[PDB]
Amino acid sequence: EIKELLKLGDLPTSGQIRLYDGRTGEQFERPVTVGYMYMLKLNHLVDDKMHARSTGSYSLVTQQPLGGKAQFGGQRFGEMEVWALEAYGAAYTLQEMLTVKSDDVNGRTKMYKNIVDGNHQMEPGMPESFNVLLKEIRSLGINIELEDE
Amino acid sequence: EFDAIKIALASPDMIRSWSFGEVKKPETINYRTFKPERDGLFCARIFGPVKDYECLCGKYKRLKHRGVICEKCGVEVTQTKVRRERMGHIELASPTAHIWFLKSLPSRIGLLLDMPLRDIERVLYFESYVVIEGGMTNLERQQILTEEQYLDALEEFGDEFDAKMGAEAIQALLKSMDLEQECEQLREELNETNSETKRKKLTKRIKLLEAFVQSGNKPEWMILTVLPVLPPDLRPLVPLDGGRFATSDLNDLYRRVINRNNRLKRLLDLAAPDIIVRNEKRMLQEAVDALLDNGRRGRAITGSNKRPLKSLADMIKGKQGRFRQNLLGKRVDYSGRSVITVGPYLRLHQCGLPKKMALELFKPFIYGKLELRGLATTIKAAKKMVEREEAVVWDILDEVIREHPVLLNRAPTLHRLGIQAFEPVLIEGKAIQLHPLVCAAYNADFDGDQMAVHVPLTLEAQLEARALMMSTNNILSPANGEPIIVPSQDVVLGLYYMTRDCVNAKGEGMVLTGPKEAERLYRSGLASLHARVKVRITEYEKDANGELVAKTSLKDTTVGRAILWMIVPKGLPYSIVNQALGKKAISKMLNTCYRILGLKPTVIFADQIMYTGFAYAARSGASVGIDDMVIPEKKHEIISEAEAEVAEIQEQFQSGLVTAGERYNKVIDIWAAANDRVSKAMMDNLQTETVINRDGQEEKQVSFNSIYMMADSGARGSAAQIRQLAGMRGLMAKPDGSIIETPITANFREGLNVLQYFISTHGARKGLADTALKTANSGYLTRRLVDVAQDLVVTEDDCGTHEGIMMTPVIEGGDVKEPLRDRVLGRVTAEDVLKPGTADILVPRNTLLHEQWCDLLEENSVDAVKVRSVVSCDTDFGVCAHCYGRDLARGHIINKGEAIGVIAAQSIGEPGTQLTMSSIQVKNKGSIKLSNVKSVVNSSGKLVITSRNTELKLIDEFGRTKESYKVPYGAVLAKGDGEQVAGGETVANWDPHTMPVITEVSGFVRFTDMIDGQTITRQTDELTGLSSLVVLDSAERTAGGKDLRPALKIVDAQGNDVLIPGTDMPAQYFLPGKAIVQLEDGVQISSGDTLARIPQGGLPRVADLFEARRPKEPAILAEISGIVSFGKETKGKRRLVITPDPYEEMIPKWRQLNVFEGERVERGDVISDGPEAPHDILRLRGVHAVTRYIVNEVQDVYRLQGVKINDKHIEVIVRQMLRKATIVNAGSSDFLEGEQVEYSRVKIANRELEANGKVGATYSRDLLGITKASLATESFISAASFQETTRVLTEAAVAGKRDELRGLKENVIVGRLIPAGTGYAYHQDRMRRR
Amino acid sequence: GQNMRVAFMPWNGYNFEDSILVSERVVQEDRFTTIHIQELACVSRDTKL
Amino acid sequence: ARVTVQDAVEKIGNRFDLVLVAARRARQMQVGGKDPLVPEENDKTTVIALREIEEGLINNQILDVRERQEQQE
Amino acid sequence: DIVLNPLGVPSRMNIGQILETHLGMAAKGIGDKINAMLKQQQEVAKLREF
DNA sequence: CATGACGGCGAATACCC
């Protein structure tokens, strides 16, 4: 029936026609299926999804960057990302992920100033999340502490 | 700043020392204002000023004023951040028990006191009494007195002793127990005890007591008299629309604790009646343990909504806990994300970055460059220029990112290559452009996928991105060493189309000066792309010294192949392109380029291949139409014939000639055959086309059908998909898994009917739900593997070990599952590999087997190579580079500092989602070899087999075995040892329903100790009528027969007994039940006959293997070699005591036994059939045996799905599974006998003792599951961050554990450089300075 | 949605891995231009000060 | 250097050690004011350091020798 | 208007998109004739017949 | 109160001497 309707419109019954390349005018070597398809634009626009952050607001308890495009948050570098960094042996990249790009308050300030100064060097410190963990364990009536140097 | 983390119990004095003040009020803040109430949870004089340098009343508001404690409000002028560091304390009116040290099994209080947890729960929660220091009365020091008996005892005698209830009594009992003398009492009682259950229970308590004795912890500290309070800034109040606050879920528990403490205090001074005071004490106790661990015991205290309140323990455990959500992973700055689109113009090292994303990401760099050239005097000026997006800002952005790599990531990050580095190129729009060739590495496509981008800030991070993570440096899979950047889909289609040949294409027979003339002719339309022509081709070959010698020759090729030759770098033969190039051919070409020329020419070649493939796929005009799905014209008659056949079978069933089950089986077989016929006809018609030759003659050629070209090239599709499109869909399965009788005869071109479509939805839904529910299991297995292997790092170049594992080709019998080449490629030999001369050394002791060495080994017909393994590596705290071998991704020997454990875990985990939860015949020419076999006289002259375990090898002339079969007992070979076989003959036959007791020497069998009617019975089956004898089972028999065991001796005409020569015992055979004596008494039994008849895988399998889970019916093995003595038989379970000093064993009687009562089995021999437990394999046959077993079993599952994973990763996991050892003999070492410790500790202690010349301790290696091994690691930090945080932390606090920051997870948590890769040297410098 | 004149062929990698190549005429004719309405709220409340 | 570090890797012998040496040299050129030993073809300090390493001009021993000479003169 | 990759059809086995495409072409063809008959101002009888 | 999950594992219980 489709081929009959194609015949009625004086169109090839195979549904394939000869196409030419607009760039060169050269004929494409084989017949190309050309027709009409009903296409939908889904509610997944790149306008709503594109997001980037250099610096911004940080969480209250942990000093890590906020989450979500609506909050201008940073991307989460989760456990498997850390596993990938460990498998590469990229220890400095991992350290800057953990400290100067996250809850190392002093480290991130020094990093920003150094980048403005043109000195691409970090001075990482203790992430605040570790201190929060220590305080939480201490609140459970457990004495956890760091030893000497 | 620190080298370790110390954990222990917190004394009340320690808790007070932490605290800065006491919280007495249960209110948080006055919500009319925003001020916190005095002495509340957010009080300012205790925790610190709310504002920076601003005391609460507000007098002192300056940096000058810092350090002065305001005497009006009481708030010290200082940084407000002290509010997240200063802790509070709550003085509890009554002592309270800590739930972690009570409920977390094993109960530390209960084990420390030997009163059961039930009694402690009743007493603490005010349901009973305990007597403390009874004295001269009959009451003990731990006896439970019920409320009804308390006053009865008080009236009987109520003054000389003491009895109490609640947490005060438990604290008194914990404080009135002397640790050391009780340890001595328990240690001596461990000697004078007869119960081995009792000795385990006592040693558990002894181990707990030693924990409290070696550390500074005191038992009474497990009862909380002072309750610490978290700093208020760690428990903030989130404003909702300003006016109102949401439930903090943590301040509420604190409020309840304070309320109940205040009530108990105001009743304590009141001297209220004891019943209500006890009730308030109990309520304060549940308030406290709800604050600590809400829901651990009893009902979970609930907030405003039915959702349980989130306690302090919840803060630190689980997926949302501190460890996994904020320490092992965290949100980062200088990051973004966007939808990915294909960039076909990109070079392998480049990505397409939107310029808006780049402007935001590199913003501080832009500010710095703006300041550098004076365009922005201040920070705000630069910010305004960037916000306005001036032209000079874009020029600066172009300058900054020129060679600053960025990291692109796609979740889930299954392997390290899920994050790769690329040079960004500014593009318009908002979508990130991705290079096609890396998509396979990312498992990325362009149907909605999004990717995250990260900016490496420091020079170290930028250089790590460039040298370690750039896509051009990571073109090989770390799992198997194979390239990852093989072209796919349209690139493969383009290369295949341009390298195809056509019989009568335009320009055929032309002779061309070279590829340039071919390109000129094709572009000018004078020659077809598939024309068979002669082309002068100059190719290059590397000589001995590595120079490219050029040879020019005339090649019979096609125009397209000559055109493609221009992008082939010098050094590759022309034969690599002189063929129709499919996916595998292109991958092989890339492999050859990498092997011959290196990395950079390979990257350039891959990019050129992708460009050419895109261009010529576009030029081909390859399409897809309904006509391309050619349905064979014989399909309808094949379907009609199958329908007639199944109708005939149905008629036979209606006539009773066949039953229902065999009718169903026959119909299924007929429909399967019809599906095969339809598929064959469709493929035959689709794969070939006719064409006019140079002369007017018909010729057959490979079809140019678009669907066939896509499938044959390997770009897209397969045989199954083609037959679903143009053949028939085939047989489908019901939801329960049974195959539907009527298949779907239609294909997708014809279209299904309602019934067929509904039937297919069953399988579609099953597959989709299977993927959805298997991804979680795969992720869990990957995480467990990562933990068990996280700390394993290559720490040495060569440990000097001589031990290794013996690598042979994997052969299951009748096929080569896996060649020796792939199992030794990139390995380091553990010993010398000889030539067949047996004297000339082919491969020395320390060679890294690259491609040339493996070529030499396979050319000299090498059967097995001993190679070093990480399992047998002598290196402590890691492995050496030599035992690990080649770095698969890099292609050379593994460097020091590589985190091979994480690499192995990812390599195994990544294909996890691809996983889906009679008589022998030689089939090829070759000589026959039997091992563990004996030659005996036979009735027909063909040898029987007698050994318990017998295997057959087929060695194909040259000396390499090709097939290996298992020969069960009583299997008579149809040929002899060392006999050539043409191939396809039954080598050996045996009846699976009969288990004989064959005797080597002929003679009359005498029924010794045999009683007729009690242990043997006569039947006469009506079909035969023979007086057959059956031995009644040792339990199923009569009472009288139970006393006597069956026995058959061998006598002959002479009268004496002829027995197995070389032994001292007469030949006696026992038939303990289920045995069929077919022959009569006194009958000559010729050798080679029967005497009695005795009848007779996916991801979860991998997880079970890596968890070392015991099978349901494990195969029983011999603990020590020797003759088996079945002293106890039947009696519920037969007890076999073997004899080498004889040792008894307990075995269920309902299990089949391969061994016989007079069989001398060796250690590790299969006594009974069933899946072998890996623990038994390790215990009896050694570390190498269990390693080989785990490797083979895992690789079976992975090969079934076509997944290629190098064995070394599984060996890394096994080595991590084998870290523990149990002390068998203490010797002179400090280890307690029978305890479990680290195998490396034992190695070091034994080495130092042998250096001193003393005797070292002996040990048994322990095989632990990956979860158990991870939880049993020395570092409590890693175990707590993994799983069971409450239990792990409780163990660490009770034992006063100390964690040296030695592993990867530990250093990640504290934000230090990991002791691997670029940080490794740093840690070395840290270690050598101490 | 919209009726699109579609051709089935590879085009220089721009349709690789389910990617779609769209003519600028589709953009010019506003075939898939869509209207999105966003509601922003400004709330003046009663502060302590 | 830029696309691949194979030459630099084989000069250093260890890829992580190569990263460390290149970082030290790049910090010398970026912050310490040192001058490149190779022509500056619009490369960054990291890539310039990698180019110097792959040509044998810069390694750990050379950097240590130059540091000692700089601080002793 | 849009170029779709043929290679996403065979393994996906969503052949309807091909048939619809063919049918879509046929549909447009009918319109392409009617539009022509409307542009030439043909008789109402001619449009009736077609 | 919710009453649709289940497999693995270790401590406790009971049963059988």
Add this chain to the structure above:
RNA sequence: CGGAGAGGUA
């Protein structure tokens, strides 16, 4: 901005 519930994308 924390939590809960619901839905969705890969």
Add this chain to the structure above:
DNA sequence: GGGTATTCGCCGTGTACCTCTCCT
């Protein structure tokens, strides 16, 4: 008093991202 089969309570169950309402 003691060894062993059965029971009961706890532990765990993929990553990243996006939208909405509602919450002392």
